[PDB]
Scaffold this active site. Structure first.
Site, PDB file in Angstrom:
ATOM      1  CE1 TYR A 174     -58.368 -12.111 -78.209  1.00 25.07           C
ATOM      2  CE2 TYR A 174     -59.370 -10.166 -77.404  1.00 25.07           C
ATOM      3  CZ  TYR A 174     -58.277 -10.908 -77.625  1.00 25.07           C
ATOM      4  OH  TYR A 174     -57.139 -10.203 -76.992  1.00 25.07           O
ATOM      5  CD  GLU A 201     -57.554 -16.437 -77.160  1.00 21.63           C
ATOM      6  OE1 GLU A 201     -56.597 -15.753 -76.723  1.00 21.63           O
ATOM      7  OE2 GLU A 201     -58.378 -16.838 -76.106  1.00 21.63           O
ATOM      8  CG  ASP A 214     -38.554 -18.878 -94.357  1.00 23.92           C
ATOM      9  OD1 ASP A 214     -39.539 -18.172 -95.097  1.00 23.92           O
ATOM     10  OD2 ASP A 214     -37.971 -18.159 -93.599  1.00 23.92           O
ATOM     11  CB  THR A 232     -44.391 -13.524 -95.637  1.00 24.04           C
ATOM     12  OG1 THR A 232     -43.564 -13.437 -96.894  1.00 24.04           O
ATOM     13  CG2 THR A 232     -43.215 -13.692 -94.348  1.00 24.04           C
ATOM     14  CE  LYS A 253     -40.695 -12.554 -97.196  1.00 26.95           C
ATOM     15  NZ  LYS A 253     -41.258 -11.656 -96.172  1.00 26.95           N
ATOM     16  NE  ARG A 296     -46.259  -5.368 -94.118  1.00 22.78           N
ATOM     17  CZ  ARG A 296     -45.134  -5.765 -95.067  1.00 22.78           C
ATOM     18  NH1 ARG A 296     -44.040  -6.224 -94.621  1.00 22.78           N
ATOM     19  NH2 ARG A 296     -45.239  -4.891 -95.941  1.00 22.78           N
TER      20      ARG A 296
HETATM   21  N1  LIG Z   1     -58.430 -15.873 -66.789  1.00 23.09           N
HETATM   22  C1  LIG Z   1     -58.411 -16.216 -68.241  1.00 23.09           C
HETATM   23  N2  LIG Z   1     -57.091 -16.159 -68.704  1.00 23.09           N
HETATM   24  C2  LIG Z   1     -57.037 -16.032 -70.290  1.00 23.09           C
HETATM   25  O1  LIG Z   1     -55.765 -16.361 -70.791  1.00 23.09           O
HETATM   26  C3  LIG Z   1     -58.196 -16.114 -70.997  1.00 23.09           C
HETATM   27  C4  LIG Z   1     -59.414 -16.402 -70.357  1.00 23.09           C
HETATM   28  N3  LIG Z   1     -59.433 -16.228 -69.006  1.00 23.09           N
HETATM   29  N4  LIG Z   1     -60.698 -16.235 -70.974  1.00 23.09           N
HETATM   30  C5  LIG Z   1     -60.523 -16.276 -72.197  1.00 23.09           C
HETATM   31  C6  LIG Z   1     -59.381 -16.721 -73.065  1.00 23.09           C
HETATM   32  C7  LIG Z   1     -59.392 -17.896 -73.464  1.00 23.09           C
HETATM   33  N5  LIG Z   1     -58.154 -18.798 -73.639  1.00 23.09           N
HETATM   34  C8  LIG Z   1     -58.017 -20.183 -72.994  1.00 23.09           C
HETATM   35  C9  LIG Z   1     -57.518 -20.895 -74.231  1.00 23.09           C
HETATM   36  C10 LIG Z   1     -56.978 -22.070 -74.031  1.00 23.09           C
HETATM   37  C11 LIG Z   1     -56.827 -22.431 -72.474  1.00 23.09           C
HETATM   38  C12 LIG Z   1     -56.000 -23.581 -72.297  1.00 23.09           C
HETATM   39  O2  LIG Z   1     -55.745 -23.820 -71.070  1.00 23.09           O
HETATM   40  N6  LIG Z   1     -56.067 -24.782 -72.781  1.00 23.09           N
HETATM   41  C13 LIG Z   1     -55.761 -26.159 -72.126  1.00 23.09           C
HETATM   42  C14 LIG Z   1     -56.598 -27.014 -71.587  1.00 23.09           C
HETATM   43  C15 LIG Z   1     -58.049 -26.877 -72.522  1.00 23.09           C
HETATM   44  C16 LIG Z   1     -59.155 -28.077 -73.096  1.00 23.09           C
HETATM   45  O3  LIG Z   1     -59.786 -28.588 -72.024  1.00 23.09           O
HETATM   46  O4  LIG Z   1     -59.007 -28.467 -74.420  1.00 23.09           O
HETATM   47  C17 LIG Z   1     -54.944 -27.039 -73.534  1.00 23.09           C
HETATM   48  O5  LIG Z   1     -54.715 -28.043 -73.415  1.00 23.09           O
HETATM   49  O6  LIG Z   1     -54.992 -26.500 -74.746  1.00 23.09           O
HETATM   50  C18 LIG Z   1     -57.288 -21.541 -71.617  1.00 23.09           C
HETATM   51  C19 LIG Z   1     -57.966 -20.317 -72.031  1.00 23.09           C
HETATM   52  N7  LIG Z   1     -58.119 -16.074 -72.433  1.00 23.09           N
HETATM   53  C20 LIG Z   1     -56.904 -16.320 -73.060  1.00 23.09           C
HETATM   54  O7  LIG Z   1     -56.802 -16.051 -74.217  1.00 23.09           O
HETATM   55  C1  LIG Z   2     -53.987  -9.571 -69.802  1.00 25.63           C
HETATM   56  C2  LIG Z   2     -53.938 -10.174 -71.072  1.00 25.63           C
HETATM   57  N1  LIG Z   2     -52.835  -9.824 -71.917  1.00 25.63           N
HETATM   58  C3  LIG Z   2     -52.559 -10.028 -73.133  1.00 25.63           C
HETATM   59  C4  LIG Z   2     -53.486 -10.421 -74.064  1.00 25.63           C
HETATM   60  C5  LIG Z   2     -52.866 -10.920 -75.560  1.00 25.63           C
HETATM   61  O1  LIG Z   2     -53.837 -10.442 -76.706  1.00 25.63           O
HETATM   62  P1  LIG Z   2     -53.690 -10.967 -78.150  1.00 25.63           P
HETATM   63  O2  LIG Z   2     -53.606  -9.699 -78.791  1.00 25.63           O
HETATM   64  O3  LIG Z   2     -54.986 -11.827 -78.129  1.00 25.63           O
HETATM   65  O4  LIG Z   2     -52.604 -11.579 -78.165  1.00 25.63           O
HETATM   66  C6  LIG Z   2     -54.809 -10.828 -73.353  1.00 25.63           C
HETATM   67  C7  LIG Z   2     -55.894 -11.246 -74.259  1.00 25.63           C
HETATM   68  N2  LIG Z   2     -56.844 -11.495 -73.793  1.00 25.63           N
HETATM   69  C8  LIG Z   2     -57.968 -12.761 -74.155  1.00 25.63           C
HETATM   70  C9  LIG Z   2     -59.277 -12.528 -73.624  1.00 25.63           C
HETATM   71  O5  LIG Z   2     -59.174 -11.987 -72.393  1.00 25.63           O
HETATM   72  O6  LIG Z   2     -60.090 -12.500 -74.379  1.00 25.63           O
HETATM   73  C10 LIG Z   2     -55.135 -10.516 -71.925  1.00 25.63           C
HETATM   74  O7  LIG Z   2     -56.191 -10.792 -71.763  1.00 25.63           O
HETATM   75  C1  LIG Z   3     -37.252 -16.085 -95.904  1.00 25.51           C
HETATM   76  C2  LIG Z   3     -37.796 -15.278 -95.136  1.00 25.51           C
HETATM   77  N1  LIG Z   3     -38.462 -15.639 -93.949  1.00 25.51           N
HETATM   78  C3  LIG Z   3     -39.280 -14.839 -93.004  1.00 25.51           C
HETATM   79  C4  LIG Z   3     -39.475 -13.546 -93.337  1.00 25.51           C
HETATM   80  C5  LIG Z   3     -40.397 -13.153 -92.003  1.00 25.51           C
HETATM   81  O1  LIG Z   3     -41.315 -12.161 -92.194  1.00 25.51           O
HETATM   82  P1  LIG Z   3     -42.098 -11.046 -91.620  1.00 25.51           P
HETATM   83  O2  LIG Z   3     -43.571 -10.978 -91.888  1.00 25.51           O
HETATM   84  O3  LIG Z   3     -41.369  -9.580 -91.893  1.00 25.51           O
HETATM   85  O4  LIG Z   3     -41.920 -11.520 -90.079  1.00 25.51           O
HETATM   86  C6  LIG Z   3     -39.167 -12.951 -94.363  1.00 25.51           C
HETATM   87  C7  LIG Z   3     -39.081 -11.562 -94.524  1.00 25.51           C
HETATM   88  N2  LIG Z   3     -37.828 -10.964 -94.908  1.00 25.51           N
HETATM   89  C8  LIG Z   3     -37.737  -9.485 -94.991  1.00 25.51           C
HETATM   90  C9  LIG Z   3     -37.093  -9.091 -96.314  1.00 25.51           C
HETATM   91  O5  LIG Z   3     -36.720  -9.984 -97.036  1.00 25.51           O
HETATM   92  O6  LIG Z   3     -36.874  -7.810 -96.723  1.00 25.51           O
HETATM   93  C10 LIG Z   3     -38.223 -13.628 -95.421  1.00 25.51           C
HETATM   94  O7  LIG Z   3     -37.675 -13.163 -96.362  1.00 25.51           O
END
Ligand SMILES: Nc1nc(=O)c2c([nH]1)NC[C@H](CNc1ccc(C(=O)N[C@@H](CCC(=O)O)C(=O)O)cc1)N2C=O
Ligand SMILES: Cc1ncc(COP(=O)(O)O)c(CNCC(=O)O)c1O
Ligand SMILES: Cc1ncc(COP(=O)(O)O)c(CNCC(=O)O)c1O
Ligand SMILES: Nc1nc(=O)c2c([nH]1)NC[C@@H](CNc1ccc(C(=O)N[C@@H](CCC(=O)O)C(=O)O)cc1)N2C=O
Lengths: 405, 405
Positions: free
Chosen positions: A51, A53, A197, A223, A226, A232
């Site tokens: 992870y 982020e 794009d 992307t 291509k 991807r």
């Molecule tokens: N309760 C909980 N929820 C989540 O969504 C979460 C966790 N925990 N733990 C880990 C992971 C960490 N994600 C984050 C990433 C950014 C911010 C966010 O609020 N940033 C604000 C302020 C931060 C600053 O001090 O820089 C921003 O301004 O960017 C919070 C949690 N995560 C979910 O991914």
């Molecule tokens: C409750 C919950 N729902 C969605 C996500 C999305 O995951 P991602 O593939 O990272 O977009 C999360 C992710 N969790 C981050 C963390 O808890 O570490 C989540 O928790």
């Molecule tokens: C011009 C242009 N812009 C964005 C995408 C998006 O890509 P994706 O990974 O699929 O979200 C494409 C992709 N086109 C598919 C195709 O041309 O067959 C694109 O051409």
């Protein structure tokens, strides 16, 4: 493959079927390509387990020490390749890349000027059934009725009439070079941002075979799979004045954790792009594209715009009283993989359409050259001009078979 | 790895460092895990080359014959796993899964009831620096300030006050079971939709160790890489009555072409969770969280909510006068990877925090049990109560090295 065949014979069977189909057919989808084994090894790596982020040096998790190296390589090879000020290599898609830029500059309902969808524009450039067209108010600009070239007078007229907050240039199916400088000029005239794009032509821009939008646009989205021939995924390049906002748009805005393993593959893909024979390879796509077109014109086919200046071509199928849907179907039996594609002012809709879109990036990657392009067209002629003949079909089958051995 | 080390030494060295780090450190990040070799192999396959916009049997490209089977294995195995009527295995992320649900049922500005970020809710469950909170009107429900358990009376109060169109249930750092019955009861009182994000707890639900949300929720979102132990990506589960609307939201709505290589690994991971062994595993996951919680409390640590009912636990580090950010850095120094995490009613901002989140999914995967959990808490007590002591840090390192070999 070692552990897959033993644990999931079902999934393994499907992947083997797909690995053989990729070699058996002649792949002319313009979006497509074939990545190196280095690229696959990176996305099959254990970076999927992390992870990460946030960004390198500013993560929300521990242990991102080594995954930060990989992201920086991707970023600094990307900046080396396109010469942009900043790069975001986390966008999961080209779609998430577009979405992030739009997220950064536009508000719900802002007006955006993007290429007409059936003239060449992409889904994420304003389709009303895509988020771009639901979220924002898109107005389109098009190509000339007979030359099928973007009408810059049309673009400026739409610009001044609609006064869009941002202008999007580029396409999924436009066979001609796009003039970024005029786009920049029109946008300055109305005080709009410029988004290019470059998805389809990113490998062509990288090898000096297509003008680079980086010097002319505020934001450049692409992307990585291509013509760039990578994994991807997506990417945003931008001036450094937009960097902090672009990065926040991606995260904490529209994405969550990046795909470090795919970010490592992008890093490898860009590594390959910086090398000299990628420039070589890119020239052959374009040469092969030129050749394929001409070979197709010789078989009696009509090409939108009269040919191509890049990697893809658009066949206006009408004169063989054909639709793009049957054309597509027909060639799938003989081993040619294309995709039905609307044509400018297509008299029919985007579910049937009047044409097929073709590209040489994939076959060029597998080593096909000029003379093998001549044969591809020959087979497309034999097949499309004699659609119900079982004899034409089967002849087609051995010739394709002769090319992919 | 065969071609990477010769193609790209810079990427290979960082991938290799990561791998070593993954074995040498005690990875306690609660949303992390270690996938199988079968899963990685599917991700490193040639399925990355295939454009497959659309759904199995309804693609916008030819040659999707094999990739269609890949996607059906994943959907059908997902439905077996959680008993959903419909499943979408295309979300690139858990972020994009959530986004597609919101895009399908909500209209810009709509009011949504979601869990607060500091009492446990996720970024996409209403943060104002996230599209969720920028695109919709998110009101938050929280946890009791003493017992740290969701206040259902509070949930119901806000629902009636605010009358949302959708109520989101679930979280990123809540260590107790979520009562889905009460959520649906409340949604029904106020005519709202109920969406459950089971990302953190999918493996447990799959294993019969957490009540399943599928029978109470209109929509179920999840990631495939947390307790589910699959590749990095998302998935939507729902009733037939919403399937078409859900599939259209994913495409042409918010994404482009799917990551077919990643859908292959999801199918592999679902096959693995369908096996009998996975239930043994998940039972140990929770038991290990129970034992590590109790172990932690034996060393003086206060836990948010008093312990854990799942795979996760939250340390309120206030008593020992440390920030979440400080604990994390020190633990990284001895080879213990955690993540700073806000705690309910935190006086600190989300990048400093007053807590650490710990989960046992990955260490259980690598075979740790009850006695390693006693050691881990002992190593954690040693370190966080002797932060200035270099002699304490070196001892910690050795005990870590003894645990990871
Ligand atoms: N309760 C909980 N929820 C989540 O969504 C979460 C966790 N925990 N733990 C880990 C992971 C960490 N994600 C984050 C990433 C950014 C911010 C966010 O609020 N940033 C604000 C302020 C931060 C600053 O001090 O820089 C921003 O301004 O960017 C919070 C949690 N995560 C979910 O991914
Ligand atoms: C409750 C919950 N729902 C969605 C996500 C999305 O995951 P991602 O593939 O990272 O977009 C999360 C992710 N969790 C981050 C963390 O808890 O570490 C989540 O928790
Ligand atoms: C011009 C242009 N812009 C964005 C995408 C998006 O890509 P994706 O990974 O699929 O979200 C494409 C992709 N086109 C598919 C195709 O041309 O067959 C694109 O051409
Ligand atoms: N001009 C053009 N633009 C594109 O964006 C595009 C192409 N062609 N060709 C191929 C590829 C296929 N995209 C499709 C996919 C879905 C629909 C759509 O309108 N279907 C509504 C539906 O509800 O399914 C249209 C084109 N593609 C872009 O990805």
């Amino acid at each position: 493959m070692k552990y897959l065949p033993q644990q999931d014979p079902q999934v393994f069977a499907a992947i083997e079927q797909e690995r053989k189909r990729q070699h058996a057919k002649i792949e002319l989808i313009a979006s497509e390509n074939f990545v190196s084994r280095a690229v696959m090894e990176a996305q099959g790596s254990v970076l999927t387990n992390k992870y990460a982020e946030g960004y390198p040096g500013r993560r929300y998790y521990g242990g991102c020490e080594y995954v930060d190296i990989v992201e920086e390589l991707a970023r600094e090879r990307a900046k080396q390749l396109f010469g942009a000020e900043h790069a975001n290599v986390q966008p999961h898609s080209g779609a998430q890349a577009n979405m992030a830029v739009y997220f950064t500059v536009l508000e719900h309902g802002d007006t955006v000027l993007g290429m007409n969808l059936s003239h060449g524009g992409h889904l994420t450039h304003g389709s009303p059934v895509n988020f771009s067209g639901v979220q924002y108010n898109f107005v389109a600009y098009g190509v000339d009725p007979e030359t099928h070239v973007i009408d810059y007078d049309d673009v400026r007229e739409k610009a001044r009439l609609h006064r869009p907050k941002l202008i999007v240039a580029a396409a999924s199916a436009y066979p001609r070079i796009i003039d970024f400088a005029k786009f920049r000029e029109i946008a300055d005239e109305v005080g709009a941002y410029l988004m290019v794009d470059m998805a389809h032509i990113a490998g062509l821009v990288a090898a000096g075979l297509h003008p680079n939008p980086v010097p002319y646009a505020h934001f450049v989205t692409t992307t990585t799979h291509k013509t760039l021939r990578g994994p991807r995924g997506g990417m945003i390049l931008c001036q450094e004045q937009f960097a902090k906002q672009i990065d926040k748009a991606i995260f904490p805005g529209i994405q969550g954790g990046p795909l470090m393993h795919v970010i490592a593959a992008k890093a490898v893909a860009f590594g390959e792009a910086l090398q000299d024979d990628f420039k070589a390879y890119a020239k052959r796509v374009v040469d092969n594209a030129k050749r394929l077109a001409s070979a197709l014109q010789n078989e009696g086919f009509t090409l939108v715009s009269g040919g191509t200046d890049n990697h893809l071509l658009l066949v206006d199928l009408r004169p063989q009283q054909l639709t793009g849907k049957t054309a597509e179907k027909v060639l799938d039996e003989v081993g040619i993989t294309v995709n039905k594609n609307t044509i400018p002012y297509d008299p029919e809709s985007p579910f049937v359409t009047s044409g097929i879109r073709i590209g040489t990036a994939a076959v060029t990657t597998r080593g096909f050259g000029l003379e093998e392009m001549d044969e591809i067209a020959a087979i497309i002629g034999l097949v499309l001009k004699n659609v119900g003949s079982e004899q034409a079909l089967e002849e087609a089958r051995q010739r394709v078979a002769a090319l992919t051995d």
